[PDB]
Amino acid sequence: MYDYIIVGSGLFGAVCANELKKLNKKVLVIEKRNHIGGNAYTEDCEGIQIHKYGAHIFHTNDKYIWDYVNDLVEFNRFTNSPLAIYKDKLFNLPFNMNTFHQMWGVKDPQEAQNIINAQKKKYGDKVPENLEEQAISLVGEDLYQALIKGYTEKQWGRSAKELPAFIIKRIPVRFTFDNNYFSDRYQGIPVGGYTKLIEKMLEGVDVKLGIDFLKDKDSLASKAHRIIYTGPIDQYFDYRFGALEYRSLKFETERHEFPNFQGNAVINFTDANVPYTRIIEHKHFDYVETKHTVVTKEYPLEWKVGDEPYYPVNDNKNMELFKKYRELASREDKVIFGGRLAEYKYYDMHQVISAALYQVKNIMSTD
Amino acid sequence: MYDYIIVGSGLFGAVCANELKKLNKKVLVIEKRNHIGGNAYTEDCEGIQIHKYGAHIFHTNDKYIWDYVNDLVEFNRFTNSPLAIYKDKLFNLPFNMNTFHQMWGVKDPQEAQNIINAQKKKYGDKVPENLEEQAISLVGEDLYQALIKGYTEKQWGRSAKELPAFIIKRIPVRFTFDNNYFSDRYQGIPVGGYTKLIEKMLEGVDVKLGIDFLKDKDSLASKAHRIIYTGPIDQYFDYRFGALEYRSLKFETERHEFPNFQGNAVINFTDANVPYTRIIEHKHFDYVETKHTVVTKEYPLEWKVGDEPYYPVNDNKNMELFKKYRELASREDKVIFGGRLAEYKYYDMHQVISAALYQVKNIMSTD
Numbered sequence: 001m002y003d004y005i006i007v008g009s010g011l012f013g014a015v016c017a018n019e020l021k022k023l024n025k026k027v028l029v030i031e032k033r034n035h036i037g038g039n040a041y042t043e044d045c046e047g048i049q050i051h052k053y054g055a056h057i058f059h060t061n062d063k064y065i066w067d068y069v070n071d072l073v074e075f076n077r078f079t080n081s082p083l084a085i086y087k088d089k090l091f092n093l094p095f096n097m098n099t100f101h102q103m104w105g106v107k108d109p110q111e112a113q114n115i116i117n118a119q120k121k122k123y124g125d126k127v128p129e130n131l132e133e134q135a136i137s138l139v140g141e142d143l144y145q146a147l148i149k150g151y152t153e154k155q156w157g158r159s160a161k162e163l164p165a166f167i168i169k170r171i172p173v174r175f176t177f178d179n180n181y182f183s184d185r186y187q188g189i190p191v192g193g194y195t196k197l198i199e200k201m202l203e204g205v206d207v208k209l210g211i212d213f214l215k216d217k218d219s220l221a222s223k224a225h226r227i228i229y230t231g232p233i234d235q236y237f238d239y240r241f242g243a244l245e246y247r248s249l250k251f252e253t254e255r256h257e258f259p260n261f262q263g264n265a266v267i268n269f270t271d272a273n274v275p276y277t278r279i280i281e282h283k284h285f286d287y288v289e290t291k292h293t294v295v296t297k298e299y300p301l302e303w304k305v306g307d308e309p310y311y312p313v314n315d316n317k318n319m320e321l322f323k324k325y326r327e328l329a330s331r332e333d334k335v336i337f338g339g340r341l342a343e344y345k346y347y348d349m350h351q352v353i354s355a356a357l358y359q360v361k362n363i364m365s366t367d
Numbered sequence: 368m369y370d371y372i373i374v375g376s377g378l379f380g381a382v383c384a385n386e387l388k389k390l391n392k393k394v395l396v397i398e399k400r401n402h403i404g405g406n407a408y409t410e411d412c413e414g415i416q417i418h419k420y421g422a423h424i425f426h427t428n429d430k431y432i433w434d435y436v437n438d439l440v441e442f443n444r445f446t447n448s449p450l451a452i453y454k455d456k457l458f459n460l461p462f463n464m465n466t467f468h469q470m471w472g473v474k475d476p477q478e479a480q481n482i483i484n485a486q487k488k489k490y491g492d493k494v495p496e497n498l499e500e501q502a503i504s505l506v507g508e509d510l511y512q513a514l515i516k517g518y519t520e521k522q523w524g525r526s527a528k529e530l531p532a533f534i535i536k537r538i539p540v541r542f543t544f545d546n547n548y549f550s551d552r553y554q555g556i557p558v559g560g561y562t563k564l565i566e567k568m569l570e571g572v573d574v575k576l577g578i579d580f581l582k583d584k585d586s587l588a589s590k591a592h593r594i595i596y597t598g599p600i601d602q603y604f605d606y607r608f609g610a611l612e613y614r615s616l617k618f619e620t621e622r623h624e625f626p627n628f629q630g631n632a633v634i635n636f637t638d639a640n641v642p643y644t645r646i647i648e649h650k651h652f653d654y655v656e657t658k659h660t661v662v663t664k665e666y667p668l669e670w671k672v673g674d675e676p677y678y679p680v681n682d683n684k685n686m687e688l689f690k691k692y693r694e695l696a697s698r699e700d701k702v703i704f705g706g707r708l709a710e711y712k713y714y715d716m717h718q719v720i721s722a723a724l725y726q727v728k729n730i731m732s733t734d
């Protein structure tokens with residue numbers, strides 16, 4: 001008889017297991033996939049650790065959380081500086097002086113700011129109610145047209161004027177020459193990959209692979225006093241009210257017999273006419289010398305049952321749907337719903353780790 | 368009676384004092400300036416910590432050394448990404464794909480490499496007779512003409528074709544888009560400045576300011592069993608064999624009543640026709656909100672024995688001179704010679720800290 005059965009071996013579940021195992025609680029982890037780690041899972045290809053479900057860069061301002069993962073696996077000092085390719089132009093992301101210099105030839109910070117502020121003139125100053133308006137209010141017309149619109153429209157397969165103002169976490173807009181994608185004090189990649197990190201978390205824990213909890217809900221749930229569920233919340237209740245909308249992704253990977261394909265870990269293609277949204281060259285995440293390189297093309301698509309859910313469409317319709325499942329969940333006796341899927345929300349890794357730690361503390365305050 | 372009298376309160380001296388005070392040794396620090404910290408000294412101007420004697424960025428691959436300084440003062444995650452302005456063109460340093468893209472429009476790593484490999488061979492395998500040929504064989508003429516020539520000529524006193532190839536033994540080149548000047552695993556600036564850090568190292572130690580050890584050598588020497596000397600080695604022996612040659616710098620600093628002057632901590636001017644070699648905007652080393660900004664222009668300065676020693680020439684002539692003083696120093700006992708000035712060498716901060724830690728361990732294991 002287990003104290004806890006944890007559904008899903010992603011960061012949320014792996015962290016709960018790592019903490020509960022130290023509190024002397026008997027734990028079982030059930031994962032439907034043939035590998036652990038969830039969306040952060042990495043796989044080695046002759047020395048190159050491959051980010052299987054999208055580029056994953058760790059970043060936080062919380063020193064306790066940075067030390068928590070670093071105490072398990074050492075992280076390098078990788079800094080995420082994505083590139084943006086639009087037609088025949090290459091630009092540096094996030095929005096900084098390098099970007100403005102490339103776009104207009106400007107070198108002076110004040111000058112660059114006047115320009116951006118002047119493109120927002122045609123549009124006026126109403127409160128932004130959609131992504132296109134929110135994007136233009138921050139970077140102006142030229143930057144939006146070249147670097148945001150086509151990209152956003154491909155990833156959400158919807159028009160920008162139709163998406164919510166905050167459907168995407170905003171990236172930096174600064175007036176210094178700095179291609180650092182994140183403003184955090186700590187940032188890096190685990191040397192050896194994330195799979196290794198999650199392995200440390202699950203060390204000394206019973207873990208069963210290839211098992212879908214929802215295919216044997218009642219039976220499996222009777223084997224433990226408490227259940228920690230990190231799968232899709234709507235699927236947990238048989239899509240009873242309809243399915244929550246997401247955007248999925250498809251990754252086309254290929255090995256090449258030369259050492260450097262594009263010279264950067266991440267490159268986005270912001271032209272609506274190029275099918276894929278990104279190309280990821282995995283070796284650049286962590287210095288290695290191999291004669292080959294593995295490159296991944298990322299293509300977005302509308303999520304259907306059977307696909308992996310990646311980007312939740314956080315608009316009013318879906319948020320009302322989520323509230324209905326939340327009511328059902330609020331009634332579920334022995335189940336704790338946590339993680340990106342169970343909460344219908346996009347979580348960065350540090351946020352999810354932080355959510356899991358609070359939840360295990362909250363469980364121990366009083367069982 | 369002190370066990371140790373440390374001459375100079377720069378990093379080398381401050382580290383020896385920090386370690387010796389930990390071993391219950393009575394220590395006295397003597398500094399000729401009115402402030403501590405040596406060449407790394409920082410001064411606050413209404414919230415902006417000013418790097419008084421040149422931009423100083425900390426970096427190391429030694430985790431022990433990084434934790435050593437961090438346990439005293441916390442460091443931020445500043446990344447040195449110097450820029451260069453040549454005429455009306457702006458380039459990213461160090462030499463990387465961003466640079467090459469700016470120079471030739473190239474985006475492919477292999478393509479950039481072909482361009483450079485070819486240009487390196489302008490004069491075939493011919494062995495470089497001078498500095499200009501040396502540089503051209505390392506990176507080609509386009510990069511050399513635009514980013515090295517004028518800069519190098521200003522910092523030395525004239526023509527590249529009239530200078531020794533030895534001056535530039537290597538010019539780092541990478542084929543990834545990465546403006547990070549240092550490849551080290553650790554890099555940052557101390558929050559609050561370097562003076563604060565050194566004050567922590569000297570905490571609880573007797574320090575005397577404004578005293579030039581050499582104007583009262585005997586009296587000051589009798590106050591301890593051992594002397595650790597970090598001043599000029601040649602000056603210590605009265606320039607007995609002549610003075611060691613150094614290159615010097617002069618700084619002109621201005622306060623401006625606006626928050627952002629150039630949007631970057633360091634910008635080099637590689638045009639021989641612009642007097643200064645660099646402009647430093649101190650606040651960008653460590654994030655702060657001030658309505659003003661302090662900017663410093665750096666100019667190569669002709670050096671005479673008496674001017675501030677910044678960079679040692681280190682040519683055969685001077686190394687020879689150094690060996691002679693080194694022989695004398697080897698006859699001087701109870702006196703330890705250490706630091707950039709005492710050893711006639713250019714040291715990075717982590718190297719000098721490392722040298723002081725081992726020097727003390729050597730001092731302990733031998734007595």
Ligand SMILES: Cc1cc2nc3c(=O)[nH]c(=O)nc-3n(C[C@H](O)[C@H](O)[C@H](O)COP(=O)(O)OP(=O)(O)OC[C@H]3O[C@@H](n4cnc5c(N)ncnc54)[C@H](O)[C@@H]3O)c2cc1C
Nearest residue numbers: 008010011012032038039054057213231339340347348349
């Ligand atoms: C494309 C992409 C890129 C990202 N990049 C970054 C980044 O750069 N930096 C960052 O900090 N964060 C990034 N993130 C966010 C990161 O992936 C999430 O924070 C993390 O996955 C959250 O952990 P989780 O356990 O909640 O969910 P998940 O990792 O998704 O894991 C849930 C696990 O539950 C399993 N499971 C589900 N249902 C069942 C069931 N019925 N039975 C058994 N097992 C089940 C799944 O197979 C899976 O392994 C990215 C996310 C995406 C989609």
Ligand SMILES: Cc1cc2nc3c(=O)[nH]c(=O)nc-3n(C[C@H](O)[C@H](O)[C@H](O)COP(=O)(O)OP(=O)(O)OC[C@H]3O[C@@H](n4cnc5c(N)ncnc54)[C@H](O)[C@@H]3O)c2cc1C
Nearest residue numbers: 375377378379399405406421424580598706707714715716
């Ligand atoms: C322009 C410049 C930029 C630099 N930038 C970087 C950088 O970005 N990153 C990095 O890692 N390193 C950098 N360095 C290197 C750094 O400055 C040195 O590593 C550091 O100064 C070495 O410490 P030190 O104690 O050996 O010498 P110093 O700091 O020079 O200190 C010696 C001290 O002894 C005092 N003194 C000398 N003679 C006497 C005497 N007779 N009596 C009493 N007191 C005396 C001096 O006044 C001084 O305070 C830079 C150096 C220069 C010159």
